[PDB]
């Protein structure tokens, strides 16, 4: 996360760390939508070009974390995966369309002051909040800046980062990139100027883009970080998987259990 700030303890209790078993390494971000289900991006699980083709056993998730490295005893929980469901229409060879995946935990994770699910949107929430100019929040453990511009230990945050970003006008972002932005995604970011522009980076992929409802006081995940324009990636705006548009698929998978 670029141009963001340190997260207050429990600010994003639904933030999840998608970890690799061996070698042990933070892989992506993700979010808790219930005590047994987790949302993250498909390209985080499957993307051959960056040699990524994981399975249930290859990785695990850490919940309730704050520190990027230090083990936070009596706060974080580790969980094995029971199954991974990446959208059947996700095609890593074309673009990021439908860049989404559901992860089922082997054991329900107990809730605490630092572990709590975020809400999934409804049509009502989308029409009132998902509009250009409205700001949303992104959290993660991705790099703080472009690689090679200083020692690595200085670009990898010690604590969870947060940054607020404005939803961008669809026509405006379609014109900023040669990449296709389908109706299953939306863009967010500051205008081409605003000097120190906040954004999400590769290590933030899979993380949640949340918004707080001024109507019922709850936090809703409107998007999943698919392609942030921060750090090393070319581009002006970040791409997010439009969570609502994929709600039916989420339900189908969960109803049947994949």
């Amino acid at each position: 996360i670029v141009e963001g700030w340190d997260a207050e303890k429990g600010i994003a209790p639904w933030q999840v760390m998608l970890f690799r078993k061996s070698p042990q390494e933070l892989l992506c971000g993700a979010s808790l939508i219930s005590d047994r289900w987790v949302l993250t991006a498909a390209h985080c699980i499957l993307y051959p070009p960056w040699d990524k083709n994981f399975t249930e056993n290859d990785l695990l998730v850490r919940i309730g974390k704050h520190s990027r490295t230090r083990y936070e005893r009596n706060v974080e929980k580790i969980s094995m995966l029971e199954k991974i469901y990446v959208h059947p229409r996700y095609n890593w060879r074309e673009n990021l369309d439908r860049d989404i995946a559901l992860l089922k935990l082997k054991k329900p994770v107990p809730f605490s002051d630092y572990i709590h699910p975020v809400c999934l949107p409804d049509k009502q929430t989308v029409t009132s909040l998902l509009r250009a100019g409205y700001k949303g929040r992104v959290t993660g453990w991705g790099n703080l800046r472009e690689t090679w511009t200083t020692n690595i230990n200085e670009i990898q945050p010690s604590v969870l980062q947060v940054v607020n970003l404005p939803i961008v006008e669809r026509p405006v972002c379609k014109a900023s990139t040669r990449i296709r932005i389908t109706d299953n995604m939306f863009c967010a970011g500051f205008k081409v100027n605003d000097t120190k522009r906040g954004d999400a980076c590769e290590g933030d992929s899979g993380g949640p883009f949340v918004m707080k409802s001024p109507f019922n006081n709850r936090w809703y995940q409107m998007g999943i970080v698919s392609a942030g324009a921060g750090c090393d990636r070319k581009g002006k705006y970040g791409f997010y998987t439009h969570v609502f548009r994929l709600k039916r698929w989420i339900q189908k998978v969960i109803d049947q259990f994949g």
Binding site: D35, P108, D122, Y134, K135, R137, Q251
Partner: protein, 42 residues
């Protein structure tokens, strides 16, 4: 809050989702919620 899933398959948590224990539950507001709510202008 109108529920959407079944807890036998979805697991626990939906009814009370989105309400942070250290914030909404304690009537405490985080450092920047303001920026967000201030942008949801009609």
């Amino acid at each position: 809050f109108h529920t959407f899933f079944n807890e036998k398959t979805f697991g626990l948590g939906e009814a009370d989702c989105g309400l942070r224990p250290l914030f909404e539950k304690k009537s405490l507001k985080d450092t920047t919620e303001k920026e967000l709510l201030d942008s949801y202008i009609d």
